[PDB]
Write a protein that binds this ligand. Structure first.
Ligand code: HAS
Ligand code: HEM
Ligand SMILES: CCCCCCCC/C=C\CCCCCCCC(=O)OC[C@H](O)CO
Ligand SMILES: CCCCCCCC/C=C\CCCCCCCC(=O)OC[C@H](O)CO
Ligand SMILES: CCCCCCCC/C=C\CCCCCCCC(=O)OC[C@H](O)CO
Ligand SMILES: CCCCCCCC/C=C\CCCCCCCC(=O)OC[C@H](O)CO
Ligand SMILES: CCCCCCCC/C=C\CCCCCCCC(=O)OC[C@H](O)CO
Ligand SMILES: CCCCCCCC/C=C\CCCCCCCC(=O)OC[C@H](O)CO
Ligand SMILES: CCCCCCCC/C=C\CCCCCCCC(=O)OC[C@H](O)CO
Ligand SMILES: CCCCCCCC/C=C\CCCCCCCC(=O)OC[C@H](O)CO
Ligand SMILES: CCCCCCCC/C=C\CCCCCCCC(=O)OC[C@H](O)CO
Ligand SMILES: CCCCCCCC/C=C\CCCCCCCC(=O)OC[C@H](O)CO
Ligand SMILES: CCCCCCCC/C=C\CCCCCCCC(=O)OC[C@H](O)CO
Ligand SMILES: CCCCCCCC/C=C\CCCCCCCC(=O)OC[C@H](O)CO
Ligand SMILES: CCCCCCCC/C=C\CCCCCCCC(=O)OC[C@H](O)CO
Ligand code: CUA
Ligand SMILES: [Cl-]
Ligand SMILES: [Cl-]
Ligand SMILES: [Cu+2]
Lengths: 554, 31, 167
């Protein structure tokens, strides 16, 4: 295409997206099996006949976690948060760098995939020492994630070219979002990068005998909280700056959108002790400080809930809906691109409620390391983020390829999105409830079928979710390949503008917007906050290291 | 007034409170 | 006109929502701080670093003889040296009297394990090289199950232990 000669970023964006969907499909194959397991049904014999490289439940859960939560989500973030800003500014990203980032992701993925598929790194997506994976797992995962540093560079480049050409203009909204997102991710990413370079890689390669498990975990969760915000914020970018147009409406506040993202930059990283409430050797005062900061990081999503709800309402009123529920009925429920994120946002209600509980220090002892935790996060990442990505099949893929969506593909997409949403809600009931009955997470409990008799009722929910989500997934695979491998091409789809929303009329802005555009200043603040929240604990742990030997217990 | 948005945040508020006070009760029952 | 008026009302009510949100989060903070001032807070691990050598913990020191794991350390206080390992807990059972303060000191000779005492708020990660210290008073006599809730290898799903609380 002459489209790809003029807009080569379309092709690179496509490659990120398809690679991410492929990872999504492969990791998700394991999901229904895991749901049946939490329903006390063992269907692993069937899976191992289908996929003979699979040696255990836990090798499956490793592939699931890594491919869905690490790989798919990152690739989606790299697609959306480079391409949307590029299109808003109508500027080309550095194409050499953009292709470098794809190849880095691809190669790292392949290198990490090899030990995983060979049963040499069955350590789960958290890879907590002294469980000791093969070196190619850590090296490949390292290169995969480092791909994002090139993404950060690319978008800072775009932003600075744009500000050079437009001095005295405020950063446009989508670009503002993306800049603070990528800067947040830089600060965030440093935990894991330190963990890998100082501890995991030298250890996996033989250069040190042991690793200190407390320091590894502390550095891990420096990255491990904000990585979920990194997963979330691409979907928020769409929800704020595209969905209002697909709803039939407008974004009701540019400044409130900016403010949500700025708070994410300041508060995403200094909170990770909320994953360590049950850990020895971290001070309880620091735990309480991180708890409080975690409740603060809820605020930007509390704000998002209202900004977005009000935009949808406005949309529905525009389309003639009247009363307190008429605005809902009036929205474009026939359009899968509209439906998918809106259903995501509904499940985000119990999902975020679960998070706030988790954040509340002592309350975490009720639910920590129980099935509650996966109940929570499937509502957040496997529902809202995933559904938003699935919605993008129906507007973004045509924009990147010129491949049309038939009426039949549109209807199928409605079915996929509904069944996925319903599946996730049902499973979330099963997991939250089993969780409250003390059923552990990360456990092949169908192999101890009498261990949890009291969870018999929630277990039915898990079976049902298991089969619903298997149907949803098979339909999703069929739909994705139907669209990709389609005959027809209509290049005017690839040439259309993206459906960016307009912002509703009204003043009030400028002063707040200018202060928020001091990005160098807010970046420095975020980093200071990290130094204060982490530096004292880390100074203490590093002066009292206790490395211990590695084990492979699989 | 944005009646629809307020209904959404009412559902969100109720959900948060049911979750939080529910678990708070469980925490003390197990104390 | 339509949009300006809608915009103005949306923003005024949003600010109300945010103040309310904040209030509710702050009340949670107060309710958490209450828990920290009560006996229920005993299950928070000690923040003090207490390092051990996972490779000699079964040969030397207070985890080496599980039949001596339960030590009276005050008039109504017992310290219990627990080993979590692939794939069980020692001693087994842990035997303590009801109504006494129990100080659990738990470590591992291999990998990370959980120590989740069903029916209680005891739920603590166990790190090789580190002692996890938590405190609890069992008010009801009987048998409590210990569940490992941290993936520790292929034996994870069958890693259980037992606490017997004597009347
Ligand atoms: C995308 C992925 C994720 C998001 C987002 C997320 C959000 C939260 N989480 Fe979480 N989480 C924790 C706390 C929070 C808090 C305070 C929030 C907050 O950021 C959430 C704020 C959200 C809200 C306040 C909801 C706002 C509602 C909205 C925006 C929807 C409105 C609806 C509309 C507009 C629709 C209206 C339309 C109509 C038509 C009516 C804690 C502890 O404090 C743990 C550790 C627990 C433990 O013991 O291990 C935890 C564990 C996890 C893990 C497991 C890690 C592991 O593997 O060990 C993952 C993967 C995860 C993901 C995510 N989590 N979380
Ligand atoms: C068909 C779809 C899905 C089903 C039926 C499903 C089911 C499950 C179940 C039942 C578990 C709990 C296993 C255990 O604790 O032993 C689990 C874990 C997990 N799932 Fe999903 N899942 C699905 C899709 C997804 C998606 C799309 C993502 C992310 C985008 C995701 C991320 C995870 C993660 C991170 C874990 C935790 C892995 C670990 O603890 O190490 N899942 N899933
Ligand atoms: C290891 C080798 C990876 C080297 C990969 C070499 C291929 C890189 C070519 C590239 O950048 O791809 C452009 C794109 O696929 C179309 O325009
Ligand atoms: C993509 C990122 C690749 C980085 C890998 C670091 C590899 C480790 C090499 C650094 C040297 C470590 C070393 O020499 O450790 C000696 C130690 O003192 C023993 O006692
Ligand atoms: C390009 C990629 C190069 C990495 C090649 C590095 C290969 C190094 C192999 C080291 C190894 O396997 O050591 C494992 C150790 O013995 C047990 O922990
Ligand atoms: C924004 C920053 C907010 C700043 C908030 C300050 C928190 C202070 C006290 C927590 C003390 C908790 C310790 C009590 C438990 C002791 C225990 O049981 O230790 C084992
Ligand atoms: C556990 C299982 C939970 C199931 C939850 C369902 C939420 C669905 C709520 C969303 C309602 C939207 C439907 C709608 O309004 O559709 C309009 C259509 O034009 C015809 O009226
Ligand atoms: C009594 C409860 C029993 C549990 C049900 C089990 C789960 C799924 C059933 C099928 C649900 C499929 C719903 C599809 C809805 C759909 O596609 O709605 C499009 C519509 O136009 C608006 O967007
Ligand atoms: C809608 C579809 C299913 C409803 C799910 C309802 C769950 C039915 C629970 C029945 C069950 O398995 O109960 C076992 C045992 O009798 C404990 O009382
Ligand atoms: C509709 C729900 C369909 C779910 C069917 C699952 C059957 C099941 O697991 O039965 C559990 C039962 O309580 C003991 O055998
Ligand atoms: C050109 C991209 C190079 C990136 C180097 C510095 C990026 C940075 O930290 O930017 C802070 C903020 O953008 C203040 O202008
Ligand atoms: C659809 C989305 C998924 C929905 C998630 C399901 C969990 C629901 C609410 C949790 C509220 C807590 C439930 C426990 C309350 C029990 C209680 O009040 O306990 C009092 C007693 O003192 C102690 O034994
Ligand atoms: C969703 C259904 C909520 C299930 C309620 C479970 C109640 C529970 O677990 O009770 C707490 C405590 O352990 C009892 O002493
Ligand atoms: C225990 C209590 C639980 C109950 C929870 C209910 C939800 C609460 C608050 C919603 C937000 C409050 C919004 C009202 C603020 C008033 C406002 O901002 O309106 C002024 C404006 O000038 C007029 O045009
Ligand atoms: C305009 C209104 C302004 C004023 C609004 C104030 C908000 C009140 C809410 C909660 C206070 C927390 C109460 C603290 C005491 C809790 C005691 C408790 O939970 O006791 C359970 C347990 O049995 C004992 O150990
Ligand atoms: Cu020990 Cu899981
Ligand atoms: Cl989280
Ligand atoms: Cl959130
Ligand atoms: Cu977190």
């Amino acid at each position: 295409s002459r489209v790809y000669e003029a807009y080569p970023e379309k092709k690179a964006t496509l490659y990120f997206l398809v690679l991410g969907f492929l990872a999504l499909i492969v990791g998700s194959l394991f999901g229904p099996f895991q749901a049946l397991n939490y329903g006390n049904v063992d269907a692993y014999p069937l899976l191992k006949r289908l996929l003979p490289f699979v040696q255990s439940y836990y090798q499956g859960l490793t592939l699931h976690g890594v491919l869905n939560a690490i790989v798919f989500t990152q690739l989606f973030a790299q697609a959306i948060m480079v391409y949307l800003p590029a299109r808003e500014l109508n500027m080309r990203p550095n194409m050499g760098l953009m292709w470098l980032s794809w190849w880095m992701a691809f190669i790292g993925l392949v290198v990490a995939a090899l030990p995983l598929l060979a049963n040499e790194a069955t350590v789960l997506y958290t890879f907590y020492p002294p469980l000791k994976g093969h070196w190619a797992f850590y090296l490949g995962a390292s290169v995969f994630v480092l791909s994002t540093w090139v993404s950060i560079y690319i978008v800072l480049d775009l932003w600075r070219r744009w500000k050079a050409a437009n001095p005295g203009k405020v950063t446009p909204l989508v670009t503002y979002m993306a800049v603070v997102f990528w800067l947040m991710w830089f600060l965030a990413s440093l935990g894991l990068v330190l963990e890998a370079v100082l501890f995991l890689l030298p250890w996996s390669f033989g250069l040190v005998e042991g690793v200190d498990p407390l320091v590894a975990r502390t550095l891990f969760w420096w990255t491990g909280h904000p990585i979920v915000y990194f997963w979330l914020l691409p979907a928020y970018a769409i929800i704020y700056t595209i969905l209002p147009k697909q709803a039939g409406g407008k974004l009701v506040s540019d400044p409130m959108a900016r403010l949500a993202f700025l708070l994410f930059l300041l508060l995403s990283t200094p909170v990770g002790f909320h994953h360590q409430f049950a850990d020895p050797g971290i001070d309880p005062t620091w735990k309480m400080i991180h708890s409080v900061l975690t409740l603060f990081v809820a605020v930007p999503s509390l704000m998002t809930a209202f900004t977005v709800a009000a935009s949808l309402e406005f949309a529905g009123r525009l389309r003639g809906g009247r009363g307190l529920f008429g605005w809902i009925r009036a929205l474009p429920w026939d359009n899968p691109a509209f439906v998918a994120p809106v259903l995501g946002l509904l499940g985000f209600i119990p999902g975020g409620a679960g998070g706030i509980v988790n954040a509340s220090f002592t309350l975490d002892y009720v639910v920590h390391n129980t099935a509650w935790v996966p109940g929570h996060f499937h509502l957040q990442v496997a529902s809202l983020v995933t559904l938003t990505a699935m919605g993008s099949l129906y507007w973004l893929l045509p924009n990147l390829t010129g491949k049309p969506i038939s009426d039949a593909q549109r209807r199928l997409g409605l079915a996929v999105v509904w069944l996925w949403f319903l599946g996730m809600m049902i499973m979330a009931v099963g997991l939250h409830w089993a969780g409250l009955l003390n059923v552990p997470r990360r456990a092949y409990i169908a192999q101890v079928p009498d261990a949890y008799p009291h969870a018999a009722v929630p277990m039915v929910f898990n079976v049902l979710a298991g089969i619903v989500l298997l149907v949803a997934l098979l339909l999703f695979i069929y739909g994705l390949f139907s669209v990709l491998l389609s005959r027809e091409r209509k290049p005017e789809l690839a040439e259309a503008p993206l459906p960016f929303a307009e912002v509703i009329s009204g003043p009030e802005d400028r002063r707040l917007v200018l202060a928020m555009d001091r990005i160098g200043f807010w970046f420095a603040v975020a980093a200071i906050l990290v130094v204060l929240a982490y530096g004292p604990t880390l100074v203490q742990l590093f002066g009292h290291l206790n490395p211990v030997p590695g084990w492979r217990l699989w | 007034k944005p009646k629809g948005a307020l209904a959404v945040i009412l559902v969100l508020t109720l959900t948060i409170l049911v979750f939080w006070l529910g678990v708070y009760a469980v925490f003390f029952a197990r104390g | 006109v339509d949009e300006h008026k809608a915009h103005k009302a949306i923003l005024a009510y949003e600010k109300g929502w945010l103040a309310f949100s904040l209030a509710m989060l702050f009340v949670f903070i107060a309710l958490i701080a209450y828990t920290l001032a009560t006996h229920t807070a005993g299950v928070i691990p000690a923040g003090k670093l207490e390092r051990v050598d996972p490779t000699t913990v079964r040969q030397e020191g207070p985890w080496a003889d599980p039949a001596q794991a339960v030590v009276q350390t005050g008039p109504n206080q017992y310290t219990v040296y627990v080993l979590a390992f692939a794939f069980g807990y020692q001693p087994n059972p842990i035997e303590v009297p009801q109504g006494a303060e129990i100080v659990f000191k738990i470590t591992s000779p291999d990998v990370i394990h959980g120590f989740h005492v069903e029916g209680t708020n005891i739920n603590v990660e166990v790190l090789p090289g580190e002692v996890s210290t938590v405190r609890y008073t069992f008010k009801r006599p009987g048998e409590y199950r210990i569940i490992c809730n941290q993936y520790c290898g292929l034996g994870h799903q069958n890693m259980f232990g037992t606490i017997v609380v004597k009347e």
